[PDB]
Design a protein around this ligand. Structure first.
Ligand SMILES: [Ca+2]
Length: 510
């Protein structure tokens, strides 16, 4: 009940639009300003109705009917109704919105017509009455309920989108537990409790202040002084062991496993990375153990796209060897015995400039001279979302943590054709239509007793991805969160698997 906390970040926020935001800094911010039909029990991945009060599924699993809560108000005071759910889904799937999450809705009837520009409304989403919205699917979809909890299906008010247009992401209006109060660009973002939030008793805090442009190391000092509550950029490597060995700081640390993989993307449409042998050479060039030492051993080396604890992870897959001689030999086969020059993009928050320097040295060992383009995250992400931009990107600090705990989440948006779109997060621009179809087939296996078979279908998909080498996977990272002594709540609210980073709506001050 009450309290005003402070959270630091070095990088800035470019958007709070739920159709657009997708990075580690704004994902949970957006979840606190907006709501969708579904959410999760705080601290877990257990689905629960949110803006829906209840729902029904047809026996064939292709018709979802949601009964909406009554009396839900947007921050502007207007009642939310089923028309707003329809509008939001029509908007996020419309290609002109440039949502990196449009593909999550591919199983809805009429999606293809919308994606192809033949329709501006999803035929499969119908407003039955002001408080009933129905979804009809073309195929069973094992991740549909999770997608009705993902930011991209959060509900926006069309009159506010019309008012601000492309600038709606700077003026978010939602139904969520907090509303935007102050946004001083490059300096501070203030969330205030929404006093009329439909979920009574939430949030607990009165105010969250995000202080921008703050050095990660200084933030630890401020936390020791009680002048901030959460260092948003976590524990810098230079300070990790000292934090761990100081009981008065170790007591502020919460550690959690993640469904995470960090990787180097290669743009499969930009020469020279349009040659599979060049991409496989890069896979054999990276010294993952050395990179992991930079982050204090807080990770294990990744040999494939899925995190080791994700269902579908190929436990047997051997992977590309770390083998400079083989990498050079492959580069020569590809017509580059003398190597080549290229660009490696990275976000500029520690430790990612240093990790990029390590990758750069690894590439130099096989004859690739890569200049590091160390930029703000928004500009790395935008360059990735440009088919003609970013030959290589180190994903550290930006991607990928599963939005929901299923192997499908590591495909569509980052390795599927659905993500190889303007503004997308498939920075490899890797589009394999045959795998897209196999992915839809795998997500149609909905019988929970067939989960093992479905996990192996996904393993087969990622086996093929790995053969085409659009990624060089590097590591699977542990999460370390720091919180001030006054911050109450269970550990799993500070390493929340869904409201990534912190569950802003359910933490509290003691
Ligand atoms: Ca919410």
């Amino acid at each position: 009940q009450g309290g005003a906390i402070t959270i630091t970040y070095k990088d800035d926020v470019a958007t709070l639009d739920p159709a657009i935001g997708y990075d580690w800094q704004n994902w949970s911010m957006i979840k606190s300003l907006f709501d969708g039909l579904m959410d999760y029990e705080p601290g877990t991945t257990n689905l629960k109705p949110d803006l829906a009060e209840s729902y029904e599924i047809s026996p064939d699993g292709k018709t979802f009917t949601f009964k909406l809560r009554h009396g839900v108000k947007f921050h502007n005071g207007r009642e939310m109704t089923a028309d707003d759910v329809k509008y939001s889904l029509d908007r996020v799937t419309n290609p002109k919105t440039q949502s990196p999450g449009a593909g999550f809705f591919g199983s809805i009837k009429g999606y293809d017509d919308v994606a192809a520009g033949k329709a501006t409304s999803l035929s499969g989403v119908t407003v039955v009455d002001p408080y009933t919205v129905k979804f009809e699917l073309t195929r069973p979809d094992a991740t549909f309920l999770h997608v009705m909890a993902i930011n991209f299906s959060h509900v926006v008010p069309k009159e506010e989108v019309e008012k601000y247009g492309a600038d709606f992401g700077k003026h978010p209006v939602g139904t969520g537990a907090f509303k935007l109060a102050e946004w001083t660009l490059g300096q501070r973002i203030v969330f205030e409790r929404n006093p009329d939030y439909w979920h009574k008793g939430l949030p607990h805090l009165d105010k969250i202040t995000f202080e921008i442009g703050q050095e990660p190391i200084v933030a630890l000092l401020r936390l020791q002084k009680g002048e901030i509550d959460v260092p948003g950029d976590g524990i810098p490597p230079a300070k990790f062991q000292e934090v761990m060995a100081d009981p008065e700081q170790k007591a502020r640390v919460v550690e959690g496993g993640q469904l995470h993989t960090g990787y180097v993307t290669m743009n499969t449409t930009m020469a020279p990375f349009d040659n599979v042998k060049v991409r496989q050479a890069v896979n054999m060039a990276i010294n993952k153990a050395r990179i992991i030492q930079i982050i204090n051993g807080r990770a294990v080396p990744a040999n494939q796209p899925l995190p080791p604890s994700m269902p579908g992870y190929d436990k047997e897959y051997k992977g590309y060897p770390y083998d400079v001689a083989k990498a050079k030999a492959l580069l020569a086969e590809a017509g580059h015995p003398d190597g080549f020059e290229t660009q490696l993009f990275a976000m500029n928050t520690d430790p990612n400039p240093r990790i990029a320097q390590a990758i750069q040295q690894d590439l130099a060992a096989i004859g690739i001279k890569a200049s590091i383009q160390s930029l703000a995250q928004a500009n790395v992400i935008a360059a990735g979302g440009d088919k003609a931009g970013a030959p290589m990107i180190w994903s550290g600090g930006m991607a990928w943590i599963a939005d929901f705990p299923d192997p499908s989440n590591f495909y569509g948006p980052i390795l599927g054709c659905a993500g190889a779109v303007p503004g997308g997060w498939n920075w490899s621009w890797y589009c394999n239509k045959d795998l897209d179809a196999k992915a839809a087939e795998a997500d149609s296996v909905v019988d929970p007793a067939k989960g093992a078979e479905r996990d192996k279908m996904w393993s087969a998909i990622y086996d093929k991805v790995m053969e085409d080498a659009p990624w060089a996977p590097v590591f699977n990272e542990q999460r370390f969160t720091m919180k001030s002594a006054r911050m109450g709540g269970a550990d799993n609210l500070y390493v929340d698997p869904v409201h990534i980073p912190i569950n802003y709506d359910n933490v509290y001050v003691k």
